[PDB]
Symmetry: C5
Amino acid sequence: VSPPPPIADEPLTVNTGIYLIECYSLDDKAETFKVNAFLSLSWKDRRLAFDPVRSGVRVKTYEPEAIWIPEIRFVNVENARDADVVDISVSPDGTVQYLERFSARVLSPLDFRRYPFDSQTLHIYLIVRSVDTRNIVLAVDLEKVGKNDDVFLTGWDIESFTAVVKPANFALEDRLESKLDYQLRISRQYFSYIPNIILPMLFILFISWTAFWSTSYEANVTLVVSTLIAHIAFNILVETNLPKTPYMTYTGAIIFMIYLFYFVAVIEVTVQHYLKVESQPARAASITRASRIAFPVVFLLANIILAFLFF
Amino acid sequence: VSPPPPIADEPLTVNTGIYLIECYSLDDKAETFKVNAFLSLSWKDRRLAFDPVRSGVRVKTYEPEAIWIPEIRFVNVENARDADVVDISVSPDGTVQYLERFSARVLSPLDFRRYPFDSQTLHIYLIVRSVDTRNIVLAVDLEKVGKNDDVFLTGWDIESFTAVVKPANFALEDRLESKLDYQLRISRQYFSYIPNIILPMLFILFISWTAFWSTSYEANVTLVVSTLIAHIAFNILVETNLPKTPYMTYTGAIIFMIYLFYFVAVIEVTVQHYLKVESQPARAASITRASRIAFPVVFLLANIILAFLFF
Amino acid sequence: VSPPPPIADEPLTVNTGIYLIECYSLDDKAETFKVNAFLSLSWKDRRLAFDPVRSGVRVKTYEPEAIWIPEIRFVNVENARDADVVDISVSPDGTVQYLERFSARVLSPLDFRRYPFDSQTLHIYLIVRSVDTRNIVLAVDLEKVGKNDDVFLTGWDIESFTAVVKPANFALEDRLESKLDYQLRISRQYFSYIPNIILPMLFILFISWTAFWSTSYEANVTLVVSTLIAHIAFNILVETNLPKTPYMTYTGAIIFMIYLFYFVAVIEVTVQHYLKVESQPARAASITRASRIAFPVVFLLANIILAFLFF
Amino acid sequence: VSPPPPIADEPLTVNTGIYLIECYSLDDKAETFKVNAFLSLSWKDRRLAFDPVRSGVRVKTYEPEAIWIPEIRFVNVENARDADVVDISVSPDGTVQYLERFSARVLSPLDFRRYPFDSQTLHIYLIVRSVDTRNIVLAVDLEKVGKNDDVFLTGWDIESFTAVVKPANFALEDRLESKLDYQLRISRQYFSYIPNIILPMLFILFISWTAFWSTSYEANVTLVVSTLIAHIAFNILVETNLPKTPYMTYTGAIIFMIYLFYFVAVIEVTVQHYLKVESQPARAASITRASRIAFPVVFLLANIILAFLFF
Amino acid sequence: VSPPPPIADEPLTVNTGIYLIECYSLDDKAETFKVNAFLSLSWKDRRLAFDPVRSGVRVKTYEPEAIWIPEIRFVNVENARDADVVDISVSPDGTVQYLERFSARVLSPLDFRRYPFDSQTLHIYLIVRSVDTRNIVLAVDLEKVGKNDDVFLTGWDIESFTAVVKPANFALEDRLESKLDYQLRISRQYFSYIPNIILPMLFILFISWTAFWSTSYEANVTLVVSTLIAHIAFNILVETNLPKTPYMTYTGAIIFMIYLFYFVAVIEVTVQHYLKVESQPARAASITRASRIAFPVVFLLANIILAFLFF
Ligand SMILES: CCCCCCCCCCCCO[C@@H]1O[C@H](CO)[C@@H](O[C@H]2O[C@H](CO)[C@@H](O)[C@H](O)[C@H]2O)[C@H](O)[C@H]1O
Ligand SMILES: [Cl-]
Ligand SMILES: [Cl-]
Ligand SMILES: [Cl-]
Ligand SMILES: [Cl-]
Ligand SMILES: [Cl-]
Ligand SMILES: [Cl-]
Ligand SMILES: [Cl-]
Ligand SMILES: [Cl-]
Ligand SMILES: [Cl-]
Ligand SMILES: [Cl-]
Ligand SMILES: [Cl-]
Ligand code: NA
Ligand code: NA
Ligand code: NA
Ligand code: NA
Ligand code: NA
Ligand code: NA
């Protein structure tokens, strides 16, 4: 078996389509997802053409070994996809209709800047390397691009699965390469983060602020230090679920800013005590009374600035 | 080998049956389970018919390669099932009786709303794609559907394994697909959650309420803050064992509600101290005495409302 | 190749034997173990018989493909065993002596009721499905059942590896099945649990009881609450190493009971303080003096009751 | 299929090239990385020579099994590479152009001395063992060495992918061996470590130093001990992400040095209290006032010395 | 293909050699290591002898299928080794020279008694089972035993790779089995354990001893209890990195002994307070002054006894 010879000097168009059956294991740390889907390939092989009246049959079925099939690969996969040929059908004019069911672990970078209120565009890149006989160009058959209704990616909302119809045709190692970008638009289900991380973290911070209504240094030290320890636990929990980004994430920014609030609260609690011992509680009382409004106001305004910078 | 030709224009019925040998690894976070079972297929191939008199035999055994076998796939599997053909038997009328032993990792969504007092319906979807020659239909042979008595899924009670007899008949990528739903009804063994999570969590909360019988702010701050830290540990332990759900879970609702009780206790403890310093323990004593009944009553009533909303 | 035809209508006895070479990875959470062993099969195929005089040879060696070999499977394996045929030898009378070396991950339930002072019986189930031509029955060749002296399962003592000689012959999906039960009796090496979990847990509890020799509520609250936090850490450590059981485990019972002791200690510490503030330390002193004997005595007697109920 | 014969007594040159498609999973603990690339091999096998007029084609395509292909292995891989032959093209003179796409987990030691401000040189070693008939020598075809622009290794900056053109030709087990060094220079994206580990760790340390502005031993003990516990959490978090090195790492050195600062702070806090009880707060006040400048100055100077020693 | 027939009744000698290429993943918990090496086999098969004059060749290359190759297995491997035949050469006298490159996960028990100051001997056991026509005995070809200079096992120093020249011949299931032991002597790089575990653990213990210079029960309770919690964290960290041993380990012994020191310190701190309240600080002062010397002296002497018992 060899590639079909050209009529003129035209390239061989291989019409593609991916129909998603399953989407699972979107690992944020690894920036990988798992996909189980149908891959459909269609090209014309004039050698395979037949007379439908003389042959009786309207379609002829071939085994992969029996005919020429273009070597389609996925660019962004960990290892080569596991594939099982579903069907190969040849029409009287010689149009080959290949279909396979594959499973692969796809490497697709994520943007965590707005986490956990972020949306992503997952990619699946199809590629074909040209041959010495003739160049192979990829196309999108929109009728064969889709996803089944039941496709669920845990903790994500699937927005759309579409292909960028114009292929990226470039030279690689003195041969032509035809690349196709299949995009899966998803958005994170941020709900869980509110009762699991966001609200517990705000509560422990507000509990620390009750020290602004207490003159007891020993009890204030306990309050602020203990709540800071609880905050560290949440910070660690959050960073163990995320990859190391060279940029600041929304959650990471909030978490870091809260450390400064704990630090300033310690300074206040210390200032309040130093003045009390120094026989001047009049100055301590004014600082503490100010902190009661200052701390929540500055926190609320700081978060407004942060949200603005990130969204 | 090609599919058996129709006598008239009837579809080709492939009678199915799944006999569960093993059920293991029900991952809640991944919403996947592992299954090891027998798959039995039965269809009529008139080309394989023989006269038992001149043949000498009543049944003829074939190798998978020797005859046409329908391409049955599982919809909701991670990767294609690992299968080993056990037996292929042909009766004189050409009724083929295929049997294989398979192992597969099944993707089946779970409903955590009532966790850990929840029941699930695990699905195993069988599918066959029709060919150009004819429409391949799936059926259920109820005599060949079951599970062995010893089938145990750790931390779960297996209620029933039944098949939805009527198949789904739809078109996918210009060919008819015939899907069957094999349902495995299970219910969670909630027992362990009571001494491991529920009761320890209630005890640490009740220990915090002993601050309503103490005038010592330093000791109260220690009590409430330290028990809140213990509660955070339990919250983290629970959420590390569950997937991120876009809905509130029963356990999650209880856990979140308890954070508010700790927060209100801090407010009370602070109010009690502010009044004591302000030379008015008469107001502090009345608030503290009220909290002694208020906190358990509100907790008990809140849980009644929660349980009602969830069950 | 087809099964050997019967002389009369008797079944084909396949004499089995498992010789354990390795035992590893006994996962308590997963209730699975890994085994690397020799599987020996022996049956008579009269068609393979030869004259040892004219043949010159006393034994004839065959390749698996050359002759009929019975399809022996393992019931409780995760996936089908990885096997490599070591040897196939035929005696002049046609007695086949097959030997293979295999590796498999075995699913075998564990009883954690007496953990970590528990013993288990691991099972390896051999099975053969009968054929249309003749019935196949399994037997045990005790000369070919054993384990090598070096077989070590980390954290376990291997007591015995024996087979239940009488097979379980039952009907499954209109065909006969012959099941064999290979039992591996083991017992847990409980030593490590004493300095790693048991003793540290008792020490933190005894440290809490020093509050019965202190009138300082602030220091008592610190003592009891902090040691309760340490106990939670040990509880979590223990439950992360065990599966969720629908029954109470010995360690789990002890751990839960200790929570009540901490809870009652808090009540005592609170009662002692309430009476001190109420200007009556005479009542507080009598309660505290009683607790000094009551707490250890009740703890020692409670553990006697627990140990009795469990052993 | 033996190696091609020599014209004179020269070795057979196999021109190599590695084109990186994907770089992922750089495990610091395991000192391994995963690579997905194109491997191109080119050698002359005169036996494959053809007349393109007689043959009809200008280039002949062969299946790997059909012709002699040099046994190229990777030295530093865990297991043999998962390879898929992309193309084998033979030109009329017998020049073979082999291309394959592979994936492999490469073992390459890392130097953690300057972590997280460290750069690495990852290695990919190609090897060929000489045969009976003639010696096989490796070469680099620079036209076939590179990496695609999109190649991203999470948490790392890829500097260059180059090959050491002169092979390492040495004798091993009485036969010649030809080794090629492909180097991938990378540098760590240190950014994340600043808000995640470095700054939180400095803040908890500075919070501890507020005890130098307090005379309360009970509050100072709380401050220093609690912040030391938070530091332990960060130390553990850091060491769980790193392998055990026989040398001191930059981060490890900083972390260790901070333990001494906490230890000396405890000594100070104890000294301050012992003098207060001993009725001499004049000595305590002078020590505490000194510590206020001493602790930050010594910390800042110590870090200057550390950074100097490491960079 | 059959084994070479014996001239007299002499057993066949298969000369072995292992040349280590890679050593990685020494899992302490699993007591397994991963190896990538060359296996060389050499035996006389007189049937393969040829005249180098007539044939014109001085060596002959065979494919594994073409000739008899002895079934060499590894005793202590998880699953059968992944091997790729590198070369098979026959000399004119019929001396076969087989070479393969393998990779395997080796199960080799470790002795943790002196951890982390322990040395191990890793084993690689080669085995051959005799056949009905000839007894096979294994030998060591010292010229073909080695390791490459670059072989690195992370956190370990590789001392030597040698073979026990005299095999361990024994009968197994009525057939001779010839076993060979390849010893890889390694010693642990203990350095890291000093700044990561040993020193932090001693510092937290010494910080606890500052309570012997304080009369404040509330501050002493805080000091000793909080440092005990930090010690529990280190104990857990250590035991999560080690398997459950039926013997006491050096680190485990030290860690356990330190629990007693914390427990006795609590008793002292309680005794000191009970005497202070009982209006007799004269007795408390003498006990506390004694503890200042007693605690470090007993600790230092206890460690001398421990180190002596273990080394
Ligand atoms: C009170 C005393 C102090 C208590 C000490 C508390 C410290 C808690 C220690 C943190 C444990 C977090 O757990 C650790 O975090 C890292 C952070 O990137 C995560 O990341 C991990 O990813 C990979 C894959 O798992 C591993 O190769 C590596 O071990 C680790 O980097 C993991 O989830 C876990 O290995
Ligand atoms: Cl393809
Ligand atoms: Cl691919
Ligand atoms: Cl099938
Ligand atoms: Cl399938
Ligand atoms: Cl078999
Ligand atoms: Cl099996
Ligand atoms: Cl190759
Ligand atoms: Cl390789
Ligand atoms: Cl071999
Ligand atoms: Cl092996
Ligand atoms: Cl023998
Ligand atoms: Na083909
Ligand atoms: Na078939
Ligand atoms: Na479609
Ligand atoms: Na066979
Ligand atoms: Na070849
Ligand atoms: Na052979």
